[PDB]
Design a binder for this molecule. Structure first.
Ligand SMILES: CC#CCn1c(N2CCC[C@@H](N)C2)nc2c1c(=O)nc1n2CCCN1Cc1nc(C)c2ccccc2n1
Ligand SMILES: CC#CCn1c(N2CCC[C@@H](N)C2)nc2c1c(=O)nc1n2CCCN1Cc1nc(C)c2ccccc2n1
Ligand SMILES: *[C@@H]1O[C@H](CO)[C@@H](O[C@@H]2O[C@H](CO)[C@@H](O)[C@H](O)[C@H]2NC(C)=O)[C@H](O)[C@H]1NC(C)=O
Ligand SMILES: *[C@@H]1O[C@H](CO)[C@@H](O[C@@H]2O[C@H](CO)[C@@H](O)[C@H](O)[C@H]2NC(C)=O)[C@H](O)[C@H]1NC(C)=O
Ligand SMILES: *[C@@H]1O[C@H](CO)[C@@H](O[C@@H]2O[C@H](CO)[C@@H](O)[C@H](O)[C@H]2NC(C)=O)[C@H](O)[C@H]1NC(C)=O
Ligand SMILES: *[C@@H]1O[C@H](CO)[C@@H](O[C@@H]2O[C@H](CO)[C@@H](O)[C@H](O)[C@H]2NC(C)=O)[C@H](O)[C@H]1NC(C)=O
Ligand SMILES: *[C@@H]1O[C@H](CO)[C@@H](O[C@@H]2O[C@H](CO)[C@@H](O)[C@H](O)[C@H]2NC(C)=O)[C@H](O)[C@H]1NC(C)=O
Ligand SMILES: *[C@@H]1O[C@H](CO)[C@@H](O[C@@H]2O[C@H](CO)[C@@H](O)[C@H](O)[C@H]2NC(C)=O)[C@H](O)[C@H]1NC(C)=O
Ligand SMILES: *[C@@H]1O[C@H](CO)[C@@H](O[C@@H]2O[C@H](CO)[C@@H](O)[C@H](O)[C@H]2NC(C)=O)[C@H](O)[C@H]1NC(C)=O
Ligand SMILES: *[C@@H]1O[C@H](CO)[C@@H](O)[C@H](O)[C@H]1NC(C)=O
Ligand SMILES: *[C@@H]1O[C@H](CO)[C@@H](O)[C@H](O)[C@H]1NC(C)=O
Ligand SMILES: *[C@@H]1O[C@H](CO)[C@@H](O)[C@H](O)[C@H]1NC(C)=O
Ligand SMILES: *[C@@H]1O[C@H](CO)[C@@H](O)[C@H](O)[C@H]1NC(C)=O
Ligand SMILES: *[C@@H]1O[C@H](CO)[C@@H](O)[C@H](O)[C@H]1NC(C)=O
Ligand code: NA
Lengths: 728, 728
């Protein structure tokens, strides 16, 4: 008899997905790390040469975290002493190695505790941030030019984001944007002076006698936000004698009237930059297009080149206004925007014209624009077979919009329904990455005639291993609620028998623009629950879910904790009526927004769920950050949306937990969803005399991701679900 | 069939013990509250009158928390706006009511947020502490005189204790002492400038958007301690001089050589005060006896009147050096000290002679000196029947020490074996308070002839109620280990049958000078466990326990987490040897020091215990306060006792927890045993992959005493014990 996929298999990563992570360095070559050696591959033929031997740094004296080869291939940036900060931020030490003279550069080294470093896009200039100030190195062995002098820990951030911009706006620590050929360096400056601090204890190793208090400028909903300024510096006119002059680009008048954000920076040409600004009430955004004036050294943003993007039904963009993709001359661009039917499609803009022309249309959405040439635009969409949870690459002929070709749809329809893509420098080649429903498949293609050059990685080794395991299956289907189709997935146990009743676990996210029903192949906790424990693990995309148009997405506008909560209950009610589901054994679980929805469901008094687990849940919107919360909720003021902020808490539902078994888990050092959120849930449950199970994770953050805490949490949750379902 | 004593009976306090709380106002009268009316009783005859009708403050506008009548009976101090701080400290608002005029005083009111207030011992002067400075009011309606100007929040404390002195030294917030007739006001000043702060989050009501960080000067083991100064001011000079001088009394040279504490303040006469000082290495203490010098206005402490108290085997006193009881003329005093055999007995001293005379002796101990007259000294001891867990009142003739009468031993020997006493102002009457083994019994007696005047409260109403309940019984006995008697108690289920095997729960304290085997009657969680669940709840007093001499008490000197832990394991083995214990169902639990011992036992690898519960445990001695920890452990330095501090942590035993079921509980706002202590236990368990159960209590302190949290904790623990013992 063959083995099942066990909890130890998941926790010890027994069955590994192989990847093929390449780095394009030109229109024809890519870098690939093989056996700690870095190889260069020719895309046309697939032949390679060793670029950097793994032994080169055997005598380095430090464990190298990562490497970054300069665009010209002359230098390599060596990252070490990595110290994680938030989701994207970290500090590290850096050394530069000259690849031509085969030596480490010992002169004018990048300092220790560097916050961010990046090569220019061409050549080998460097820009780095240290102690919140920007520095530029024209040559790796030469002294740095100090760009900013205002940097102050937790107050002034130059060229790096503060907590909320890192997490919610840029999904990055960097706030530096080099011009295409590296002449200019654009940067944002954030000012957190009046932003309140979240404070929490950090216990550290047992040797620390007194716990430390961590203090982070973090704006909760309605609190004072950071302010932002934007600048551009010419790196070709830097002096060792004079301080660098940064030219400020001010936000338009429509933004300066009140609180606002900088939400996108995209260079158009060597002398043209586009910026998008968003109002704090996130349903109005403005793009400025700014040109360098050689005679005055100034950057001018013509009012005739402004582009307004607004929404009457919700917020702008999926999580923020989309990025423009400019043509070679920068006189026009392509951008995904919500059409008049509420579906996100590609619109073609002229820099000086208000009206844009939609180039795609239909009841499906463009996910992202991937590459642009003079003849074609390449994009990913969920058009294929009307499956919102599938993704394919398409190209559209720019001279005739009726000519749309799917490039990935028919490559392997049974194995591959979810693709991402990586194009070479001028789109001569593309790597397709299939992530499901079958095992991931990486292939290389040439754009001229869409030739399928070669298979890069097909996971045939994992396929051989999985043949000896009783693996679960995945069913992707839909239910109809008020004439609308809503999709769900079920992770089904091996040898699934529709005549038998299985316990069911509802795995929830259900936040705005979420998608939990898709064609992706995953090896996770749900795999173990289905394979070993014979539990069906279901997920449902109801109102507020993404990639299906604004009628669905904006259904929860100004109303979090309403329809998306009701829809998870309705899906389980419908699944409970299916002949293969044991209605006495339905559970629910989620992390983050999914933890909030799980808690709201468990306190709804529906009677559908026996038990559930919330991990690091939001419990009250006033506790969460301004950028994410206000995007959907507006402001917690009597004149705006305070009543709904007050009616959407988990704490108000405490009495309804009397009829369920609840497990509440939270890391004590969570800088994102503060431990406070779960501390208020437990206090509300104690106040009404409801018993429940709890677990805190000392010094773990939102990820509960340390090796030992990851193993402990899944072990604890597994015991809980098994007890709930009467499983030995 | 009679009902059992259920968990709801305990939690809802259905079966209530009646008390008889009187307040002596003179040598022959006491105040007592009946139906919210304050009555005044004549002790000789038992007749009463309404002192203050319950209607008096109906139109006050605030709920009155407490009251204090001035010694002269002219005024009443009304306490309201009570806001609890630590174990003893709190702030409140106060109004004074003129009893003669039957009018509330509206001018020169005691300010809001007053920290401490006390009448003088005679008349009606008041001393109070506000914003860490001392003030004196000669008359209730007249302006205050400011005594100190140095008070500073968390830094300088005048007339009030800091955290550590409140908790570990004085067991009181007050640090002021009026002279017997109120002429002088003595006070201590604490300086916490360099004392490190414990910091923790306080979440508050759900309306609070950002958690507050509570910061308290708290010296952990070996950290910088507060410093102390002592002053005496002449309150009779206040209305005559602009700024009356506070005369400092400095500590002796033997104390000034290093860190020290002020540990006792006792006035001897109108012009003589005694002070006891203790070295930071708590095995050396010095008493100074200081006289007012009328010519110089200074206080002088003659070296011929200095008394040294030291210990070669342990620390000085049970928890601190004992207080002296002076004869009327202040030329001699009585004090409890450890004799040559290590038993605490009453010693009689002349103020200027170094050798004292023991007036009691034997293999038993004096617990406290209760009253002293010109002819007799009254004390409580555990002499009766050689039972260390019993307490009786004795009277010794000062002109003939062979004449010792037991005043309470034979009053009701079956019902009453644990007494406390309350004497009238000049010891003319005494109230005896019997607390077990039967129901509490309160009686009044005349000192002139030792006759019983009347029964004040016999708990007959509760006795009638308990007749219809299947109550557990209590066994108090001893086991002989290494030729030493060690006492234990067992709460036995109703209809206890020694031919049956019962599950056993070991209820642990086991700290130095602890006593868990006694004759007190209690209605608590153990009552429910034995009555409803048929669990034997046992407690054992092993090495380190109190009231049995220093050979037992000092056995754990410099070695906490050793013999007292081993002795609890041995006790459970000895209980199994008795034949009525199911060896497969032995559990252990404790709170505070008991929580540390429970955790050390569960991590010992003994195999004796199936499960256990630790509530707010100490986990590492370096995390606990200096005064308590260092008393037994010395300093955590390589030269002193660091090796043992490092060897006695719970965390080092984590791997052994794989053999047991553990439940760890802690209040997040515990200022005493910091949440840090359990946060370090959980992290060590996660690190070795041990599954366990946990529960935090938001904003609860060391007592987990709010009505809702108290009910929640005992409910949670009851489910855990029942699950461990396979009880439905
Ligand atoms: C509070 C909150 C929130 C909303 N939120 C956001 N946004 C946009 C990015 C910045 C962020 N501040 C807010 N992305 C989110 C979520 C979320 O709740 N859950 C997820 N994702 C994306 C990753 C996948 N999941 C779901 C998820 N997340 C975790 C952590 C899981 C852990 C184990 C198993 C499944 C999991 N599934
Ligand atoms: C850490 C530590 C410690 C030692 N400690 C001390 N000393 C002297 C007073 C100042 C203090 N800082 C240190 N008194 C203590 C204890 C203790 O561990 N347990 C107790 N008592 C006295 C009352 C009864 N119990 C046992 C008990 N049993 C229950 C059920 C409790 C419940 C809530 C709070 C305390 C409890 N305590
Ligand atoms: C980064 O940190 C290292 C170590 O602190 C610095 O390297 C030298 O290292 C030794 C100890 O490892 C010290 O005695 C010296 O003070 C260090 N200084 C020099 C100038 O060699 C190193 O210099 C730091 N790097 C930068 C760029 O500041
Ligand atoms: C990158 O682009 C910049 C801006 O277009 C180029 O700088 C200009 O170069 C021409 C020389 O042919 C001069 O006439 C301009 O005055 C320069 N402009 C500025 C703003 O400095 C630059 O040479 C390009 N660099 C590379 C390496 O291609
Ligand atoms: C942006 O959204 C806000 C809030 O929904 C809209 O505000 C108007 O102003 C207040 C709400 O604060 C109400 O009196 C109106 O009913 C709102 N208009 C609506 C709901 O249509 C604001 O109009 C929105 N901006 C755009 C461009 O749609
Ligand atoms: C207890 O009873 C005694 C005696 O009846 C009361 O004492 C006083 O007795 C004298 C006898 O001449 C009466 O004139 C008074 O009525 C009593 N004086 C006062 C000041 O009350 C005594 O009052 C009673 N005590 C209480 C507290 O009611
Ligand atoms: C409380 O103790 C602190 C020291 O812990 C004293 O502060 C010092 O005061 C002197 C003036 O006599 C200064 O020269 C020092 O700079 C201070 N040191 C620190 C560490 O603050 C303080 O004076 C004491 N206060 C009282 C009222 O006794
Ligand atoms: C009362 O007397 C005390 C003791 O002299 C004064 O306290 C001094 O105040 C001054 C500044 O105002 C400081 O320089 C000294 O360090 C203080 N000493 C002590 C021991 O506290 C106090 O200010 C006087 N009050 C009035 C109203 O004069
Ligand atoms: C309380 O005791 C104090 C201290 O003995 C008394 O004050 C002294 O009284 C004598 C007269 O008996 C004078 O010689 C001294 O000058 C006083 N000393 C001080 C320091 O004030 C006081 O009179 C007693 N109070 C009462 C109300 O009896
Ligand atoms: C690949 O092969 C071609 C010749 O056929 C050669 O020009 C080139 O250097 C090779 N590229 C690499 C990256 O090894
Ligand atoms: C940051 O903002 C504050 C106002 O909140 C202003 O005082 C300060 O000058 C700013 N600093 C910089 C460098 O812009
Ligand atoms: C550059 O600016 C900084 C900060 O204001 C100043 O300290 C420094 O003297 C300046 N250097 C020159 C060359 O002007
Ligand atoms: C105490 O506070 C109340 C309300 O703020 C105020 O009306 C009253 O005057 C205060 N009492 C004193 C003695 O300051
Ligand atoms: C006090 O204790 C310390 C540490 O045990 C010791 O070195 C010193 O001799 C002690 N004093 C007495 C009187 O035993
Ligand atoms: Na091919």
């Amino acid at each position: 008899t063959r083995k099942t996929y066990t909890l130890t298999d998941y926790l010890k990563n027994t069955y590994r997905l192989k990847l093929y992570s390449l780095r394009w360095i030109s229109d024809h070559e890519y870098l690939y790390k093989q056996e700690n050696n870095i190889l260069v591959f020719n895309a046309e033929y697939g032949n390679s040469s060793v670029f950097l031997e793994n032994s080169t740094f055997d005598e380095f004296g430090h464990s190298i975290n990562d490497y970054s080869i300069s665009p010209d291939g002359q230098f390599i940036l060596l990252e070490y002493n990595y110290v994680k900060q938030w989701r994207h931020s970290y500090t590290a030490s850096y050394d530069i190695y000259d690849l031509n003279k085969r030596q480490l550069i010992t002169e004018e080294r990048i300092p220790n505790n560097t916050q961010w470093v990046t090569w220019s896009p061409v050549g080998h200039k460097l820009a780095y941030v240290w102690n919140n100030d920007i520095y530029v190195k024209i040559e790796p062995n030469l002294p740095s030019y100090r760009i900013t002098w205002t940097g102050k820990e937790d107050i002034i951030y130059n060229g790096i984001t503060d907590w909320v911009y890192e997490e919610e706006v840029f999904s990055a620590y960097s706030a530096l944007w080099w011009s295409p050929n590296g002449t200019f360096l654009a940067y944002a400056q954030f000012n957190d002076t009046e932003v309140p601090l979240i404070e929490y204890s950090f216990y550290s190793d047992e040797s620390l006698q007194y716990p430390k208090t961590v203090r982070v400028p973090y704006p909760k909903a309605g609190a004072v936000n950071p302010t932002v300024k934007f600048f551009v510096v010419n790196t070709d006119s830097l002096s060792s004698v004079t301080n660098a002059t940064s030219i400020q680009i001010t936000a338009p008048a429509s933004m300066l009237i009140g609180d606002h954000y900088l939400c996108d920076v995209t260079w158009a040409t060597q002398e043209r930059i586009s910026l998008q600004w968003l109002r704090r009430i996130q349903n109005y955004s403005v793009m400025d297009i700014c040109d360098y004036d050689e005679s005055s050294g100034r950057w001018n943003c013509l009012v005739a080149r402004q582009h307004i993007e607004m929404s009457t039904t919700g917020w702008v963009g999926r999580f923020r206004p989309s990025e423009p993709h400019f043509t070679l001359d920068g006189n026009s661009f392509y951008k995904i925007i919500s059409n008049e039917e509420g579906y996100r499609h590609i619109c073609y803009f002229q820099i000086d014209k208000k009206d844009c022309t939609f180039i795609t249309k239909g009841t499906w959405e463009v996910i992202g624009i991937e590459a642009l040439t003079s003849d074609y635009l390449y994009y990913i969409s969920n058009e294929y077979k009307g499956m919102p949870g599938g993704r394919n690459l398409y190209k559209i002929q720019l001279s005739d919009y009726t000519k749309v070709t799917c490039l990935s749809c028919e490559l392997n329809p049974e194995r591959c329904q979810y693709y991402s893509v990586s194009f070479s420098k001028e789109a001569k080649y593309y790597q397709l990455r299939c992530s499901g429903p079958g095992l991931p498949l990486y292939t290389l293609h040439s754009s001229v005639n869409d030739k399928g050059l070669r298979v890069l990685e097909d996971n045939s080794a994992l396929d051989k291993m999985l043949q000896n395991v009783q693996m679960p299956s995945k069913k992707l289907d839909f239910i109809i609620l008020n004439e609308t189709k809503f999709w769900y997935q079920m992770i089904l146990p091996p040898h699934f028998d529709k005549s038998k009743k299985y316990p069911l676990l509802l795995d929830v996210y259900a936040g705005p623009c979420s998608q939990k029903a898709d064609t992706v192949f995953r090896l996770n906790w749900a795999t173990y629950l289905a394979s070993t424990e014979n539990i069906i693990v279901a997920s449902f995309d109801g109102r507020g879910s993404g990639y299906q148009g604004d009628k669905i997405m904006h259904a929860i506008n100004r109303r979090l904790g309403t329809f998306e909560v009701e829809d998870q209950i309705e899906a389980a009610r419908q699944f409970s009526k299916m002949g293969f589901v044991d209605n006495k054994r339905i559970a629910i679980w989620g992390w983050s927004y999914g933890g909030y929805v799980t808690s709201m469901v468990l306190g709804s008094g529906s009677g559908v769920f026996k038990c559930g687990i919330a991990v690091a849940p939001v419990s009250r919107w006033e506790y969460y950050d301004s950028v994410y919360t206000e995007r959907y909720m507006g402001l917690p003021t009597p004149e705006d949306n305070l009543d709904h902020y007050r009616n959407s808490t988990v704490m108000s539902r405490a009495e309804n937990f009397k009829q369920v078994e609840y497990l509440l888990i939270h890391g004590t050092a969570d800088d994102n969803v503060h431990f406070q959120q779960s501390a208020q849930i437990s206090k509300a449950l104690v106040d009404v005399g409801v018993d429940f199970q709890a677990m805190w994770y000392t010094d773990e953050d939102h990820g509960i991701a340390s090796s030992t805490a990851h193993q402990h949490i899944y072990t604890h949750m597994s015991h809980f679900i098994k007890q709930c379902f009467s499983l030995p």
